[PDB]
Structures are given as structure tokens and as C-alpha cells.
Write a protein that binds this DNA or RNA. Structure first.
Ligand SMILES: [Mg+2]
Ligand SMILES: [Mg+2]
Ligand SMILES: [Mg+2]
Ligand SMILES: [Mg+2]
Ligand SMILES: [Mg+2]
Ligand SMILES: [Mg+2]
Ligand SMILES: [Mg+2]
Ligand SMILES: [Mg+2]
Ligand SMILES: [Mg+2]
Ligand SMILES: [Mg+2]
Ligand SMILES: [Mg+2]
Ligand SMILES: [Mg+2]
Ligand SMILES: [Mg+2]
Ligand SMILES: [Mg+2]
Ligand SMILES: [Mg+2]
Ligand SMILES: [Mg+2]
Ligand SMILES: [Mg+2]
Ligand SMILES: [Mg+2]
Ligand SMILES: [Mg+2]
Ligand SMILES: [Mg+2]
Ligand SMILES: [Mg+2]
Ligand SMILES: [Mg+2]
Ligand SMILES: [Mg+2]
Ligand SMILES: [Mg+2]
Ligand SMILES: [Mg+2]
Ligand SMILES: [Mg+2]
Ligand SMILES: [Mg+2]
Ligand SMILES: [Mg+2]
Ligand SMILES: [Mg+2]
Ligand SMILES: [Mg+2]
Ligand SMILES: [Mg+2]
Ligand SMILES: [Mg+2]
Ligand SMILES: [Mg+2]
Ligand SMILES: [Mg+2]
Ligand SMILES: [Mg+2]
Ligand SMILES: [Mg+2]
Ligand SMILES: [Mg+2]
Ligand SMILES: [Mg+2]
Ligand SMILES: [Mg+2]
Ligand SMILES: [Mg+2]
Ligand SMILES: [Mg+2]
Ligand SMILES: [Mg+2]
Ligand SMILES: [Mg+2]
Ligand SMILES: [Mg+2]
Ligand SMILES: [Mg+2]
Ligand SMILES: [Mg+2]
Ligand SMILES: [Mg+2]
Ligand SMILES: [Mg+2]
Ligand SMILES: [Mg+2]
Ligand SMILES: [Mg+2]
Lengths: 56, 75
RNA sequence: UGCUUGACGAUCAUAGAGCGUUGGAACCACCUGAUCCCUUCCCGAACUCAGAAGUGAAACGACGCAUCGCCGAUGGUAGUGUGGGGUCUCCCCAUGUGAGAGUAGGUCAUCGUCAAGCUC
RNA sequence: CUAAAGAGUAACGGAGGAGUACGAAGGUGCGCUCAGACCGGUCGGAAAUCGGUCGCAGAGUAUAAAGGCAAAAGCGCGCUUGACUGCGAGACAGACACGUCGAGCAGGUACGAAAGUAGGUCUUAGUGAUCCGGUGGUUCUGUAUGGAAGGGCCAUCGCUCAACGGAUAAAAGGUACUCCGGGGAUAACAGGCUGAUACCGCCCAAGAGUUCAUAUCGACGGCGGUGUUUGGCACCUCGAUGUCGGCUCAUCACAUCCUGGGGCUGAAGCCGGUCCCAAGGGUAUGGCUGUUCGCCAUUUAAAGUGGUACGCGAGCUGGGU
RNA sequence: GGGCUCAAACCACACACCGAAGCUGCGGGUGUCACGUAAGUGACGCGGUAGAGGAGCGUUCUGUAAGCCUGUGAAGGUGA
RNA sequence: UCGAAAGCUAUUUAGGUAGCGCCUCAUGUAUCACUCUGGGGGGUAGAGCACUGUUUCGGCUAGGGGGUCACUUACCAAACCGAUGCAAACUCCGAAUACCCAGAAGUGCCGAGCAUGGGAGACACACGGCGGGUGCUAACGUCCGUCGUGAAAAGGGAAACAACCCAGACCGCCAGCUAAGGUCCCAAAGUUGUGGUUAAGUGGUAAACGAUGUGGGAAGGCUUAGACAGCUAG
RNA sequence: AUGGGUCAGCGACUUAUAUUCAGUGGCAAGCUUAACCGUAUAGGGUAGGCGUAGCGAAAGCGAGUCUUAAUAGGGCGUUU
């Protein structure tokens, strides 16, 4: 499938690998939405940084 | 009577973990005694250094009648 | 066809220990003797040699038994990564993870190569 | 150990060791298995040597601890010198300099019948760069030439250079007679944070109080408050924030010394004790001492306790410091 | 702080709204890549001390310059 | 345009310097990060008592001490048995994380990686969270690990308030939506809605301990064979 | 905490010689001169410097060389 992911919280002051999880999904700024393939590798980045994202 | 002395850290321990490619001569374990024992293709140094005698991948195994942890090199 | 015995392994206690029963045809052990090879900081005890009168007593092998040992869940609990919160020496919530102990229970192993005998 | 299950990781953190030893305590082949307990046994006893059972590493391993140890890495015996020479794939460790491990090749050995094992010791401490000088080798160099000297190369010796990356071959103090450059990076004063300590209050109540815990006290313990003493820290100030005491002038708090109002009393009265309320006003003079204080004398209704840069030196003093 | 008590407090739930230089909109500049052998388009960027890198302004003198400007007013000064 | 450090090691060194770490530029070269899956070692949190120490009961029993002076125990106590606790320098056990390696998708602002070279700065750090030592689990204390912020970061919130919360400012706009935090007035936005609690201005500072404050819940005793309280009498 | 009463003027990364790296030029297996000469920024002067070969302490050997008993391993070098 394919899932809509939107960054809703700022990346300032997060852990480095949480930022790399948001950066690894293609997200650049707050309220920016990407379309990533619903794959286990992409899901693990969404699950790690769930508190920063809005997934729908 | 008092304290304040210590010796330098010896940088002991496992250098190559299970499934890592090894060349012959590669040091696998630095240890004080034989916490790990030399299995197939693995040599033992004066100071009980475990080193590779053949090329392959590290395999850690516990086996034998004494429950010794062995370091072996497999293909 | 399978069994028994012996040697060597796999594995290293769910495999061990203890207790009890059993095996001498062969194998093995105990056994006989010591001049010969060889041995004892003394001693044929062990090691070694030449044997087969005696015995399965010891040991060993097999079989049985949860007394010990060993193995051991499920559930819960403790801890804990991340995010958040409180009354912030310490805790809680969401999510992920998850023991140790203990409990129910389990175990008197399993497999391979070769040689001899027997069985079918 | 701290050290947070890879490595590493500080403190004038918590504990111990080293500055060696061994030609056997190294190598190898062969062989063996401790400590302790119990029983029996001449001296012999808790414990000596001997025999038996249990024991299964609780012993040993030159030495501190930790990690190891059955192919024992522990113990004995025979023969030995591999505690060899050149090296060295490849790694670990690491700022550098140093450091660690090492298969394998060649030469030459030792032990074993042989496969094999041996480049020191169960491992991790036992150490000191360069310069300079000394000694043994050397096919190198040799200031015209041949030599030599001297130099190079290889081997090796001389540092508690221990402040151990070692300034020199060679080195202690005084300064209130002091001086410069700096620092609030760092002390003394005051401020700040904190509150161990201090002071004040409370909780429990064994006990004292003739009996009677709580009129008055109250052990053993516990909980607070204040900022208030002795401290802790080092945040402000070292291109300067004047110190103790006195004098003058104060201002605030209340945990009240007098006066005012009360409850309880082990309160007959007079006088007290304790607690609650109350901050309006008041709240000594001298001797000694620089004293604050204190002791003393004599008063007073009383001679309060604190904060205010231990109030107050661009207001005085200068006795102390 | 005023003031507040069937709160303007506390507990629970819900729907609104306010709120930044965050995000979006509109206009502009600039950096780096890519496409462009072009003007330019596209994407992503553009807080900053020590410090590194890049690109400029202005002043005096020399050449260009025996030129050019200048008493129909130079430099300087003072306003727009 | 990019953009640190206040670390390690050494230093007659400690407020200096040097190599490495971290910044920048250039050249070259192909790695790197996140996640998933798979392969590893560990001895921490927790736990435990199998070892080493340290506990407390009880049972049984040496041995020691009394009465004899050959027998029996007034009194202590080894071991063992059972129950029961503790430990940074205890461990029969033992996570989560973190770390090492391999393979794989997408995303990297066009690059992350590495190498070589030119130029540095820096080697006084501070606070907050978490794990610790130390201190009194005192200090805006001190010393480590680790992350975040400040340093070198403006804006909004926390009254004011480096280090906390939200968020990272290229410029302009008299446009809109949100974050933290808020919405009676100061002062932008609910004197919003629903159901409760509080009466202390608690809210809007604190403990042991004390109390018929008040709300909810689950039980129990006595009770119209007279409960509790009051009154009369014994 | 420091410094500055204000204004105007002055006031601090320079220069020489050696050198390394970068950029940009000349020439190129060569490149370049110094002193000096020179009717003199020309031209000459090529002594010297760097490069074209390395290894070794060195004698020396040389695309090899050093270590070594070793033509084995290894070090550095050689394919510009
Ligand atoms: Mg015999
Ligand atoms: Mg029998
Ligand atoms: Mg279990
Ligand atoms: Mg379990
Ligand atoms: Mg560690
Ligand atoms: Mg760790
Ligand atoms: Mg005896
Ligand atoms: Mg005895
Ligand atoms: Mg030994
Ligand atoms: Mg001569
Ligand atoms: Mg000589
Ligand atoms: Mg030193
Ligand atoms: Mg004098
Ligand atoms: Mg001075
Ligand atoms: Mg200071
Ligand atoms: Mg002070
Ligand atoms: Mg001050
Ligand atoms: Mg001043
Ligand atoms: Mg009062
Ligand atoms: Mg008064
Ligand atoms: Mg009046
Ligand atoms: Mg007096
Ligand atoms: Mg007088
Ligand atoms: Mg004063
Ligand atoms: Mg004054
Ligand atoms: Mg005066
Ligand atoms: Mg809105
Ligand atoms: Mg706005
Ligand atoms: Mg913006
Ligand atoms: Mg735009
Ligand atoms: Mg920005
Ligand atoms: Mg900028
Ligand atoms: Mg002029
Ligand atoms: Mg930037
Ligand atoms: Mg020195
Ligand atoms: Mg624990
Ligand atoms: Mg990986
Ligand atoms: Mg320093
Ligand atoms: Mg420092
Ligand atoms: Mg620090
Ligand atoms: Mg501090
Ligand atoms: Mg400090
Ligand atoms: Mg600074
Ligand atoms: Mg702010
Ligand atoms: Mg404000
Ligand atoms: Mg309003
Ligand atoms: Mg309303
Ligand atoms: Mg209040
Ligand atoms: Mg009644
Ligand atoms: Mg001044």
C-alpha cells in the first residue's frame, strides 16, 4: 500500500535517530506531507517517531 | 594508607562477533584467562589471545562436557 | 531382520546420582605366575609380559524406580527503550519489551561408524 | 570497584599490590591428582607419618587482585636448552613515541616410537626516551696516498633521571623594605545559595513529680520552622564594596523584659510557675577591660531577643585589628 | 494585580476561539545542485560567536591623461 | 555560503602549548545514516543465596563450662536441618537498551562516507533531564557518563527570568491556520456547555502528628423479642 | 564588572629575505639564471638551482636496492 505521513511537531531538540527517522521518510518541515510505500522498513521509521508524525 | 591508584584499562574483550568475516591472523578475543576457548581454526596466544588461523566467519559455540564457550571459524 | 558385547564418536545431567534386579556362550573384567620385555624414590598395588585353573564377588553393561539432583512452563510481578505526566530521594500513564524466583509439571536420555557373536 | 551487560570514562572517590624471581620454577616425553573430615594405629597430643571410606577442587598455581586451569595451566621423574638466529601474512591497541598477539617460511636444535610440541614462565605489574661515554664484532668510511685515529653499522653496559615524556653536568631560603603584570579564573569582609551545626517549636511518653505521664519537667527516639551561630560552596566585587569596639542618629520583627488582657497551676493570701493574646509606649548608671561579652557594685516597673553591609567612618572616634 | 466561590478554584468530558519571526498565501532577493552549451526553469536551502571560504564599496597616489571637465564656476563645505 | 570547541593525551604543565577530536576550503575516491530482517558477545537494571561476607529465629547436636571427682547436665556454643533478610569491590541467574557484523526498500538537497592536502579556532564551559561517585541522595556544590538547550539562537509561553516549554528569524504585507500557553478586567480569545467536589480565598508554599469538616464505596455489630442517647430506681 | 565628558584630527597585521601550498601564466624533458657585462626594464651571462631514479648508515649497486646464509619473506622504489 501507501500511507500519508505528515510532520506535525518540530524536529528541534529531538534525538538524532528520531530526526533521521523523519528525514529518512522524506519529511522536511512541519505540516509537510509525504507518500511513502507501506513497507516494514518505512513502518519502522514511522513507529520510532510516531509522536512527531500524523499517519493516515 | 590511603587510596588514589589504578592501572590502565587493558582494552580486553571480543573484537569480532558471530558471523563476522575473518582473515588469518585476525585477533578475535582479548582475555585474561580462557573465558572463551579456541575451536576449529582458532589459535591461543601466550596471554590467551584468541586469533584466526584460517579465513572464514566467526562462530561462537558452547559445547563439551565442561560447558566451555568456544570460538571457531567456519566457512 | 533385530539383539548382545567391545572400540571410537555426536551430545554434555530431561543424559547425573542413589537404591534395587540381572549378564558370563562370546566379549570384558576380576584371575594364575613372574624366569622373559618392562615397572616400583619400597611393594608385579599400578605399568609390563606368558597364560587360561577359577569367578561374575568387585568393576562394567543392561533393566526398573522420582529419594536427591537436573530440566521447567502459563499467568502475574520486577526492571526497561521511546513519548508524556506527578505529590518528583520516588513513581505513574501510552506504547514496545520483559525477567529472576516460585508454581503446574518433566526426566532413570538420544543418535552415528566399525568389529565379533547370536537371532530371524 | 566506581564504570550505567562492547571499548573507554573523573574525583585529595573506595580497596590492595609492583620497582622482582627462576638454567629451573623454561622445553619435552612419561606418569599422578588436591584441601578437609571420620575410623583404626608406639611414643603421637587438635594437628607429624601409616591404612581405609567419604570427599570432588571448598586445594594448588613464586608473588596482590581479577579472570582462568582436566589435553589440568596443579604435582613428580628422565632427557634437555626453543629463555634459539633471520624474519613474518595478518591483526589488536593507539595523538606521537612506545606497546601487544601471532600462523607460516628458512637455518639450526631439544624431547618423543610417532603424529607432534617448544621463539620462556596460567595471564595481566617487576620499569626509563634521547644525548654522552664504555665494551665485543664489522665486508662500511678513512680530509694528498697507504695505514691509523676518529666516525658509521650490529650487539651490549652505565639513570629511585621515582616530579618516573626524563628543562642543567651542576641549585636552598627571607622580604612587614618591597616592586611589576594579572585574577573576583582564587582566599580574607560583607552579599548570595544551602542548612550539617546553631537557635526556636512540635510528636511519642519510660520516668521524676508523696499517689498522679503531660502543674512543672521529661529519657530513648522522631518531625519541622528560622536564617540566627559555627560551617559548606566560590555566584558578585581584587582598573579598591573601609575592619572590631565606642559615639551620634536610628528603623523594623516578635520568638515580650515591663506595663495591658486572659487559661491552667503541685494557684489559701502576698509572691510565683507555665501557656495564650498583645509590638502602644517604655526598657540603667558605674568599676575593670579596646572590648562585644562577662564579672562585680548600686539602681529600676523593666534593665527584652533579633534584622537592618555582624544598621550607621563622602557623620565623628581610632582604644583593638 | 484587580478581583473571583452553583468560580474567574479543583476533577472529568465536549465543542469553539485566541495565540509565534512555526506553517500557508502574495510579492522580492540570494546559495547549491540539475536541466539547460542561453535568457531561464525545477528542487531543496538561506539564526549564528571563534573561525574558514567567496564577492564587493570607498579613499590617496601612478598609468590611460599634452586626454576630458572646469571662472558660463574645480576641490571642499552645507541643504534637497 | 558554511560554521565549532571549552574534549583526550603530554607537558616545571594546569588561564600556555603540541598531536588527535570537533570547523572550513580544495582535490580525489566510493562509502555512510535512518529503519526492517538475520547473526553475535556481554554480566548492568532486576533478581537470588549456589560461592565470599554479613542477618534473625527455631530444632538437633559437638565442644566448652556446673554439680561427681566416676555419672548427670544449671549455663555458652561448632556443624547440620528448616524458616528468614542484606551486599559497589558477592553471583546459581539475568533483561531492556546500547554496541559489532551482514543483507534489503525508500529517503538524504544532491549528498551523506573515506583519503590526501591548504587555513583555523578551541583545549575556563554552564544549566536542565536521566545513570552514578562525593557531599547531608545539602548547595545555582563538586566529579564522571549520556542526551537537550545556552554558549553561538532571535520569536511565543513561564509576571519579570542564558540553560525550562513551543519553536529555529533571507526580506516585505494593516492576509489566513496553528504550537506551548491561554480565553472576567488590566490584556487577544468561552462570564461556553454538561456532571460532580471545595467553603478553606483551600486554590494562591511545608512534615511527623491531631480532629464528630465534608463526598463516595465495600463490609460488620446491636435493633419494633424495643437498638443508641436521655430520665427515674436498684 | 571594564572603558569612554564630547567633538575634530591622528592611532594598530607592515617590510625584507628564504620557503610551502593554491590560483593564474611562460616554456617544457627540460625549466630558470645570480653576480656581472650591457648608449642598459632589451640582449648576453646557464657558474649555480630544481627536474629527468631509486635503495642503502655507507662502500656501492641501480629499475632496482636494503636486510639476510637466502635469488625466501619483508621495507622503500619503479607502470610517467
Ligand atoms: Mg595382574
Ligand atoms: Mg554383581
Ligand atoms: Mg524455574
Ligand atoms: Mg522464569
Ligand atoms: Mg564496559
Ligand atoms: Mg554500557
Ligand atoms: Mg591420629
Ligand atoms: Mg582427630
Ligand atoms: Mg606453574
Ligand atoms: Mg689517509
Ligand atoms: Mg668503530
Ligand atoms: Mg611526567
Ligand atoms: Mg618591624
Ligand atoms: Mg600591583
Ligand atoms: Mg567567582
Ligand atoms: Mg563569606
Ligand atoms: Mg557583592
Ligand atoms: Mg570602578
Ligand atoms: Mg506573640
Ligand atoms: Mg519595643
Ligand atoms: Mg490607640
Ligand atoms: Mg559596664
Ligand atoms: Mg577611676
Ligand atoms: Mg555593621
Ligand atoms: Mg557610610
Ligand atoms: Mg572624614
Ligand atoms: Mg484560530
Ligand atoms: Mg504571525
Ligand atoms: Mg519561516
Ligand atoms: Mg515566494
Ligand atoms: Mg532559518
Ligand atoms: Mg548566515
Ligand atoms: Mg584631492
Ligand atoms: Mg548554518
Ligand atoms: Mg619535566
Ligand atoms: Mg540490584
Ligand atoms: Mg547494520
Ligand atoms: Mg589547559
Ligand atoms: Mg579543560
Ligand atoms: Mg564537564
Ligand atoms: Mg556548578
Ligand atoms: Mg563551577
Ligand atoms: Mg565564549
Ligand atoms: Mg523565550
Ligand atoms: Mg514577556
Ligand atoms: Mg478581552
Ligand atoms: Mg459559566
Ligand atoms: Mg494560599
Ligand atoms: Mg437505654
Ligand atoms: Mg569611566
Amino acid at each position: 500500500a501507501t500511507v500519508k505521513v505528515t510532520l506535525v511537531k518540530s524536529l528541534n531538540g529531538r534525538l538524532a535517530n528520531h530526526k533521521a527517522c523523519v528525514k529518512g521518510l522524506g519529511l522536511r518541515r512541519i505540516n509537510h506531507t509525504v507518500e511513502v510505500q507501506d513497507t516494514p522498513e518505512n513502518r519502522g521509521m514511522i513507529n520510532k517517531a510516531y509522536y512527531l508524525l500524523r499517519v493516515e | 594508607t590511603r587510596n588514589g591508584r589504578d592501572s590502565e584499562s587493558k582494552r580486553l574483550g571480543v573484537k569480532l562477533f558471530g558471523g563476522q568475516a575473518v582473515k588469518a591472523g585476525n585477533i578475535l578475543v582479548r582475555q585474561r584467562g580462557t573465558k572463551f576457548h579456541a575451536g576449529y581454526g582458532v589459535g591461543l596466544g601466550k596471554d590467551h589471545t584468541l586469533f584466526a588461523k584460517v579465513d572464514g566467519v566467526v562462530k561462537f559455540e558452547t559445547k563439551g562436557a565442561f560447558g566451555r564457550k568456544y570460538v571457531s571459524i567456519v566457512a
